[PDB]
Ligand binder design. Sequence first.
Ligand SMILES: Nc1nc2c(ncn2[C@@H]2O[C@H](COP(=O)(O)OP(=O)(O)OP(O)(O)=S)[C@@H](O)[C@H]2O)c(=O)[nH]1
Ligand SMILES: Nc1nc2c(ncn2[C@@H]2O[C@H](COP(=O)(O)OP(=O)(O)OP(O)(O)=S)[C@@H](O)[C@H]2O)c(=O)[nH]1
Ligand SMILES: [Mg+2]
Ligand SMILES: [Mg+2]
Ligand SMILES: [Zn+2]
Ligand SMILES: [Zn+2]
Ligand SMILES: [Zn+2]
Ligand SMILES: [Zn+2]
Lengths: 211, 209
Amino acid sequence: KDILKANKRLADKNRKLLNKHGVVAFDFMGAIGSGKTLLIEKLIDNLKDKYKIACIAGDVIAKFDAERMEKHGAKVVPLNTGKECHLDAHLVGHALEDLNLDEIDLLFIENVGNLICPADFDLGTHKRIVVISTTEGDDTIEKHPGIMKTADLIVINKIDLADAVGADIKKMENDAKRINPDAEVVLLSLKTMEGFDKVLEFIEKSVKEVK
Amino acid sequence: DILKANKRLADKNRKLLNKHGVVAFDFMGAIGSGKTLLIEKLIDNLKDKYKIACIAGDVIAKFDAERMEKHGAKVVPLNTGKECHLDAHLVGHALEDLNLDEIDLLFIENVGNLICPADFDLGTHKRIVVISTTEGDDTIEKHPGIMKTADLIVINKIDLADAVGADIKKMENDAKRINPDAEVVLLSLKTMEGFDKVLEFIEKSVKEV
Ligand SMILES: Nc1nc2c(ncn2[C@@H]2O[C@H](COP(=O)(O)OP(=O)(O)OP(O)(O)=S)[C@@H](O)[C@H]2O)c(=O)[nH]1
Ligand SMILES: Nc1nc2c(ncn2[C@@H]2O[C@H](COP(=O)(O)OP(=O)(O)OP(O)(O)=S)[C@@H](O)[C@H]2O)c(=O)[nH]1
Ligand SMILES: [Mg+2]
Ligand SMILES: [Mg+2]
Ligand SMILES: [Zn+2]
Ligand SMILES: [Zn+2]
Ligand SMILES: [Zn+2]
Ligand SMILES: [Zn+2]
């Protein structure tokens, strides 16, 4: 199989096109229901005064999250993935054709909920974000090191629920730091909004550092 | 067609299990839904009546295998690597490492994944999908494929439903609409509310083979 080699070529092409039009793109990965959509929703709300934001929403049935993002004023391209367990640069490249990249500053891509397959499939983004939550259990990070090593930012979300599931958030934070020393690691609650400042900081730092 | 090869091996697996009087269950779900904790509780309640074995499938299978072992089950760990689902082939090899004449119940924990496990019959008698409220109340209608393969749909962590804004009535209705033939149970493994209904499904399923 030559799958991963052909994907990378398309990812580099995606990145070059985005750079050509001054677009900074983020890949939002995570487990099922970790909080990817709600994070994106909050990011749109709090950055739209400064940036023109577009989204690509990928899932079995993309409409649910597409509709959520749209009500926040962002242009969304939905991608129904169906039986596929991941997105790829090929599909993302075609979604880009539906966007006016000259009228876009930021691109948020919500990947399929999956802590395994998306690790191998570069989409052509500048940064990769992995979102997990306390409610998945505090062994979630050490159980899935592969995807963690591909992240630029690891978000441990739903910290407000940690005690209710018996999750040690300090342990999780340390797991993340240890498995990927180069990543930023943020403890977040999208309910209380604690930690959100650090996610915004990551977005802004990323924009300034491009190329 | 790798799915044709899988079906062939699934029928082979099921044939072997029937031969030795073993009833097998495929526990599917999202990541952290509560598959292992449900199996742990099932072992505790059933181990006096039945000889129980387990297959624990995950990237690093030791975590769940050890959790199951302390409850008094024979467990075969299955490291799934970069593969995102168990298949009949891998399960067939695990069955070769089990003494099936000394086993009544087989519990298989599939990889945490609501997509591709729907396509890969393992050779079990019943399929169970565990989701949880903390994944959001759109989770069931977002994954109809896997839902239609389930004999039992478990909506777990009802104790945390209000905290995440999940409507458990919606989730229960979504499940029944998508799979009218499935049993649907509202569960908290913390409080144990609904556990009796899951246990009833297991015991009935065993007697019905
Ligand atoms: N209490 C609490 N609930 C949260 C938090 N973050 C997200 N949620 C809740 O979790 C559920 C899932 O959030 P959602 O944004 O849909 O996850 P997702 O990762 O996008 O889910 P997916 O289906 O696409 S895979 C929702 O009910 C949402 O309100 C949090 O920090 N604290
Ligand atoms: N509050 C509450 N917590 C629960 C409930 N069910 C499971 N949990 C918690 O959720 C976390 C994950 O449970 P676990 O049994 O490990 O899920 P899993 O499906 O086996 O997770 P995986 O990594 O193999 S994919 C654990 O910390 C467990 O205590 C519940 O009903 N209520
Ligand atoms: Mg989402
Ligand atoms: Mg488990
Ligand atoms: Zn094409
Ligand atoms: Zn996969
Ligand atoms: Zn798979
Ligand atoms: Zn083999």
